[PDB]
């Protein structure tokens, strides 16, 4: 039939006169509005404070149309001015001044929003400044996880409000313009706030996106201020300022601490660092490709000497040469490279040793390797001590360093132990499975692999390889997640297969050539044990597991079929499905990572360059044997900051004026400008 339509939640309606009054305000007819007001004062026929269907009153209509003439008229007739200031601040106009000067239920603004908060949210420097000129305060948000304060225990009541209110406060404290106007050190404030906001993003699972966005706003603000630097003198004053030695790039270090990657990667900042890095190599990069190689190789070859000189006469031409950051890097890399070469010499077994001697005396090459090992150890020790465990723990490569070193230690221990005991010699075959010498050799091999793969870190120093290394790392996180799923599937099929074939396990002796396992000429007993089943399934992923392993000797057809079917389903789920899915996932991330590859790489490279910029550094083999000042510094920083802020605010405004489209509100404003204009002229001409 027909669905009747009615207004269910009805609301009071405007009388004809009232409708006309509001209509005049939308047309800007001062005369009619004025008259209506005056008449209302007399005949009391119109509620000056009436409301439109959308809930907007006259003052609100005037504010939106931005007709200050009419606004004044209405205010003079004492119209309810509740929340009007907030609406004006949102419109970002000078009507705010009027309402403030004019001083003394439905709102589009939550009950918590205060004039300053909204101004901050709008980021209008001028309006913010006006409000701040008069005493204004933004509540300090309690520290993350501040239950002690029973005030935080208000979350029990209306948590929604609690959460929103907090976000609103932070959304304000994180306004570039407020930080500019209020904070003493705008840069440091942003750094810190951006971090707290990140932490909150985590704690407040919901509203995470908002906090993260606010954090990025802060980070970009800092970069933008830096970008407004024009001279090196300024850049140095900013990057070397210590809040409270100086000349230690303190602010840059703080940035690295707060993972302010964009700031650390700003072109001008990177330029300064380079000058420090390539000290002594004027235009090293400019040096012809080959030339560079030549110089690097030569210096590397001379690493021991340079090292020795520093050891001999720190204050000598040569002694000073090693102190240069680039030289340190060249030397410290050449040292590691020679270490790896020594390990290679072992492969070729240049110094061959009898395979029968138990715990032989450490071979010649070994001794040579021993120092480097010790040097690396003490190095890590120094790092830990100097940087504190927290920082050392943070570094992921430190884990690899720790592992590599630990393996080298055990290798040595066993080598030693095998010497005191097992002093005699027996045919290797007789040696028990866990003979110390045997175990040591295995540990050594594993360590060698780890050591050589530590060179990946050096890629960060290369313009081409670095970005890739960084991207890979980011993707690795996701790969790990995928691995967990794969593992679960493996375990499942492993349990199942083992459950079916364990009834048919056979003895090694029985097996041909007394060989039992998936690694024998004729694979056998592949699913007999869980340990073996797990191995078999892993190798299947690479196609190295033959299909004949799915048949039982007794030839029970049904079982074998179920077994093959389970193995087959595993192959499909693992190779056809999961493996392929990983490709899709990795493609998705690589795409994203690619967006921010450079900043990531440069942040990483800086960290590396900075490490060498320090003074405590010698290669691993030879590694083991006045308030006045602050006042001036701060004054200068403040001057530079003042200028940077000034030029930043202007830029932002200019960008807006020239890089923003005209929205409908703009049309309405123009239409009103002409309308009010018309009415006035007509009245004058009439």
């Amino acid at each position: 039939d027909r669905i009747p339509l009615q207004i269910v939640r009805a609301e009071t309606e405007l009388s004809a006169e009232e409708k006309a009054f509001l209509s005049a305000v939308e047309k800007g007819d001062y005369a009619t509005v004025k008259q209506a007001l005056q008449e209302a004062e007399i005949y009391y026929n119109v509620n000056i404070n009436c409301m439109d269907p959308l809930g907007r009153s006259a003052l609100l209509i005037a504010i939106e149309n931005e007709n200050l003439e009419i606004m004044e008229l209405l205010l003079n007739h004492s119209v309810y001015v509740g929340d009007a200031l907030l609406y004006a601040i949102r419109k970002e106009v000078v009507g705010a001044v009027e309402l403030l000067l004019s001083y003394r239920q439905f709102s589009e603004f939550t009950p918590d929003i205060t004039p300053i908060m909204l101004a901050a949210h709008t980021n209008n420097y001028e309006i913010i400044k006006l409000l701040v000129q008069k005493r204004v305060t933004i509540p300090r948000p309690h520290q993350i996880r501040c239950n002690c304060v029973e005030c935080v225990s208000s979350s029990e009541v209306d948590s929604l409000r609690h959460s929103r209110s907090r976000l609103n406060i932070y959304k304000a404290l994180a306004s570039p313009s407020l930080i500019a106007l209020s904070s003493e050190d705008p840069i440091l404030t942003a750094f810190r706030l951006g971090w707290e906001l990140k932490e909150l993003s985590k704690v407040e699972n919901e509203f995470k996106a908002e906090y993260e966005e606010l954090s990025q706003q802060c980070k970009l603000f800092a970069k933008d201020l830096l970008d407004q630097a024009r001279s090196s003198r300024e850049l140095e004053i900013i990057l070397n300022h210590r809040d409270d030695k100086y000349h230690d790039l303190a602010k840059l270090k703080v940035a690295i601490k707060y993972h302010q990657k964009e700031f650390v990667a700003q072109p001008n900042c990177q330029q300064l660092l380079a000058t420090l890095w390539y000290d002594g190599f004027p235009g090293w990069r400019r040096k012809h490709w080959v030339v560079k190689l030549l110089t690097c190789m030569t210096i590397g070859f001379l690493f021991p000497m340079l090292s020795i000189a520093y050891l001999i006469s720190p204050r000598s031409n040569l002694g000073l040469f090693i102190k240069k950051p680039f030289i340190k890097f060249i030397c410290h890399t050449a040292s590691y490279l020679t270490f790896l070469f020594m390990l290679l010499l072992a492969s070729q077994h240049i110094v061959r040793t009898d395979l029968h001697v138990q715990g032989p005396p450490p071979t010649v090459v070994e001794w040579m390797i021993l120092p480097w090992v010790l040097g690396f150890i003490w190095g890590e020790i120094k790092e830990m001590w100097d940087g504190g465990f927290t920082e050392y723990i943070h570094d992921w490569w430190n884990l690899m360093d720790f592992a590599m070193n630990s393996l080298y230690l055990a290798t040595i221990s066993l080598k030693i132990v095998a010497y005191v005991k097992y002093n005699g010699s027996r045919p290797r075959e007789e040696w028990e499975m866990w003979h110390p010498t045997l175990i040591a050799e295995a540990l050594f091999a594993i360590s060698n692999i780890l050591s050589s793969l530590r060179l990946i870190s050096l890629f960060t120093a290369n313009s081409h390889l670095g970005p890739l290394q960084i991207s890979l790392g980011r993707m690795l996180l996701d790969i790990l997640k995928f691995l967990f799923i794969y593992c679960l599937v493996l375990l499942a099929f492993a349990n199942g297969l083992n459950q079916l074939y364990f009834y048919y396990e056979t003895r090694a002796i029985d097996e041909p050539n007394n060989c039992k396992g998936i690694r024998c000429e004729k694979q056998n007993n592949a699913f007999s044990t869980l340990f073996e089943t797990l191995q078999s399934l892993f190798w299947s992923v690479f196609g190295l597991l033959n299909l004949y392993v799915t048949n039982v000797k007794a030839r029970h057809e049904f079982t074998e079929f179920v077994g093959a079917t389970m193995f087959g389903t595993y192959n499909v789920i693992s190779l056809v499905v999961l493996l392929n899915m990983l490709i899709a996932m990795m493609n998705n991330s690589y795409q994203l990572i690619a967006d921010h590859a450079d900043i990531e790489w440069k942040f990483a490279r800086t960290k590396l360059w900075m490490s060498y910029f320090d003074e405590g550094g010698t290669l691993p083999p030879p590694f083991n044997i006045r308030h006045a000042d602050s006042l001036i510094q701060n004054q200068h920083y403040q001057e530079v900051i003042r200028n940077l802020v000034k030029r930043y605010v202007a830029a932002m405004i200019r960008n807006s004026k020239t890089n923003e489209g005209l929205t409908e509100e703009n049309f309405k404003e123009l239409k009103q400008d002409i309308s009010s204009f018309r009415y006035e002229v007509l009245d004058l001409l009439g």
Binding site: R230, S232, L235, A274, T275, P282, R286
Partner: protein, 150 residues
């Protein structure tokens, strides 16, 4: 403003004797540039990154950032289609050659690569556009078979 530029003449800050032109070129305004270039102007030549005399060493010592910005600004000006059109006898060849230079500089000045590369692309596009304006094939021949070498 144009009108204003006119009035003023009628009666950051990498320099001042040539900054008006440098900015105009960045403003890529043919009219304003026409006005300014009326009075002889001579943009300084950006010395190559190779120099080591106080010519550059001193500056690169006092303010490396300013020096670098200065050179970028000069090039941002020289690579303005308007300036090339007004001041170059063979606008196309200039665009070709300048594009090459602005690329080399991208390699050298790794810090501002993106900036120097944008300018290069700008020059390349300009030349393509000027060719696109050909209408008959006689013109095309004249253009594609012309040499700047005697």
């Amino acid at each position: 403003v144009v009108g204003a530029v006119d009035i003023l003449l009628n009666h950051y800050s990498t320099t001042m004797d040539v900054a008006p032109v440098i900015l105009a070129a960045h403003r890529n305004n043919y009219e304003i540039l026409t006005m300014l270039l009326k009075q002889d102007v001579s943009l300084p030549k950006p010395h190559a990154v190779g120099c080591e005399c106080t010519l550059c060493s001193a500056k690169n010592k006092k303010d490396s950032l300013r020096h670098s910005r200065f050179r970028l600004d000069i090039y941002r000006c020289l690579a303005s289609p308007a300036l090339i059109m007004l001041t170059e006898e063979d606008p196309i060849l200039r665009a070709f050659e300048l594009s090459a230079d602005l690329k080399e500089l991208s390699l050298v000045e790794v810090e501002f690569r993106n900036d120097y590369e944008e300018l290069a692309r700008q020059c390349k596009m300009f030349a393509k556009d000027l060719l696109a304006q050909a209408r008959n094939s006689r013109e095309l021949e004249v253009i594609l078979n012309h040499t700047s070498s005697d």
